[PDB]
Design a protein around this ligand. Structure first.
Ligand SMILES: O=c1[nH]c2cc(C(F)(F)F)c(N3CCOCC3)cc2n(CP(=O)(O)O)c1=O
Ligand SMILES: O=c1[nH]c2cc(C(F)(F)F)c(N3CCOCC3)cc2n(CP(=O)(O)O)c1=O
Lengths: 112, 111, 34, 111, 55, 56
């Protein structure tokens, strides 16, 4: 039973996985373009996600990106966070190298 | 040798379908994912893009339409309409549902 | 409900024929010791 | 250009004429362009079936690009790579879809 | 309210700055006030999680 | 393995189960108010289902 239940478990590789679960809290910065994306979103998945975060308590939103990083690192995998891809990769290289980006980008943007 | 190069993308498809894991073939990301929907859905993309690229609307130089076309592009992009249509013409039109085919695989018997 | 066959299902009949023949082969070898 | 799924013929495309003949991602996109920029449009396939490479000999862009250089096409809306060599002669808009080189493999099925 | 751009955006609109080179997200609202170059780094929303070390 | 795979399977008790699968085909009458309900549908589940039947 241990090995079986162990094998059933799978790592998240799409935001949809969060929609399919609830064990792991997830969210974005308390303010910024990012949350407004989900708020304006019409895709059913992202809409479900924003609908979730708006209702979920205590609220997933955090005051600062650093605070979100701390909330992820200390949650021991029970709290995923969402942020700009390049920023995520830039953090993942940083010590303690305890956190990592997963999956493809949810959407397109480009600095110019 | 024999050369990894192939005359056509279709040739690459023919090799990879015959490769049985002996060979892998690079190509344009959206095209690859577009193949993923296609039957027999044997193919699968792996890894991120090697390099950024982006198709864009082209207009003759000095065309008056230029700027309005541009604003129209960004406007449609932010509305997510592009992603919507992408989900349409790719996955929604897909011959093989990815998580649909993934949900459907529970056999048995014994070697 | 399957009759008899359901017990047989987990392991193929051929595999049974094989274990039988193999056991028969093992069996005589002890006699060779005698 | 004729590229699935961006541009595809109708099952009864022979039975149909005009914009009715065409369907695809670029079709929906261009339709949205017609919506926002407000204009009539009639889709036309490029004659050589090519994106429009610049000849290194005649120093002449062919294809859709030559159609732009020579005004044969009012505007281009195709899966067309943006490049510095092309931007100089014709004006690309901000790209509508980031993409890159990607790895295709058959999905593993060991036994 | 004031409809006044702030930040680097204001610095461009108000002539305070000659050119902007920064991780500046393109937006339609900023497109009409100043002129972006073509994007030099595709990017988007992404998932950060704890790294799953075994013990 | 047989008993385990046996217990994992569950009877359908919501249309959503169909949306989450594909192995069992599903549909309605070729015409009628019912089909109209799905083509006019805006609920994500029913929309997914009608989208499915639309191309299947
Ligand atoms: O502007 C360009 N846009 C292109 C768009 C596509 C497609 F994906 F089909 F839309 C393709 N294909 C990739 C798949 O196999 C069929 C042809 C080639 C393109 N090329 C040729 P390159 O010079 O080798 O990049 C361009 O130049
Ligand atoms: O043009 C924009 N470019 C931006 C670039 C970045 C960064 F990633 F740092 F480069 C960030 N951050 C995300 C990480 O935490 C620190 C600030 C915000 C940006 N915003 C504000 P938004 O409205 O919250 O997106 C813009 O407007």
């Amino acid at each position: 039973a241990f090995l079986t239940v162990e094998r059933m478990v799978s790592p998240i590789e799409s935001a949809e996985d969060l929609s399919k679960q609830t064990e792991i809290a997830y969210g974005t910065l308390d303010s910024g373009s990012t949350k407004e994306f989900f708020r304006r979103s019409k895709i059913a998945v992202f809409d479900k996600m924003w609908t979730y975060m708006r209702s979920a308590e205590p609220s997933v939103f955090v005051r600062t990106t650093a605070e979100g990083v701390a909330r992820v690192r200390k949650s021991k995998g029970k709290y995923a966070y969402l942020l700009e891809s390049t920023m995520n990769e830039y953090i993942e290289q940083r010590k303690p190298c305890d956190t990592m980006k997963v999956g493809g980008n949810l959407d397109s943007k480009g600095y110019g | 040798e024999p050369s990894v190069f192939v005359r056509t993308t279709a040739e690459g498809v023919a090799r990879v379908r015959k490769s049985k894991g002996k060979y892998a073939y690079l190509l344009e990301s959206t095209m690859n994912e577009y193949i993923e929907q296609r039957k027999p859905c044997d193919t699968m993309k792996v890894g991120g893009n090697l390099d950024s690229k982006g198709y864009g609307i082209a207009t003759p130089k000095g065309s008056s339409l230029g700027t309005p076309v541009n604003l129209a592009v960004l406007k449609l992009s932010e509305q997510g309409v592009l992603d919507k249509l992408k989900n349409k013409w790719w996955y929604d039109k897909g011959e093989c549902g990815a998580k649909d085919s993934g949900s459907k695989e529970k056999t048995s018997a014994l070697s | 409900k399957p009759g008899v066959f359901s017990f047989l299902d987990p392991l193929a009949y051929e595999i049974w024929m094989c274990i039988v023949f193999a056991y028969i082969g093992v069996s005589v070898v002890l006699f060779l010791v005698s | 250009i004729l590229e699935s799924p961006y541009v595809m013929m109708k099952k009864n495309h022979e039975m149909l004429e005009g914009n009715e003949r065409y369907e695809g991602y670029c079709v929906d996109l261009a339709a949205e362009i017609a919506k926002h920029c407000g204009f009539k449009y009639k889709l036309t396939i490029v004659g050589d079936g090519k994106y429009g490479a610049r000849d290194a000999d005649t120093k002449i862009w062919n294809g859709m690009v030559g159609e732009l250089v020579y005004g044969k096409a009012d505007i281009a809306i195709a899966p067309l790579t943006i490049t510095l060599v092309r931007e100089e002669v014709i004006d690309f808009s901000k790209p509508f879809m980031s993409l890159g080189i990607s790895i295709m493999i058959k999905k593993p099925q060991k036994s």
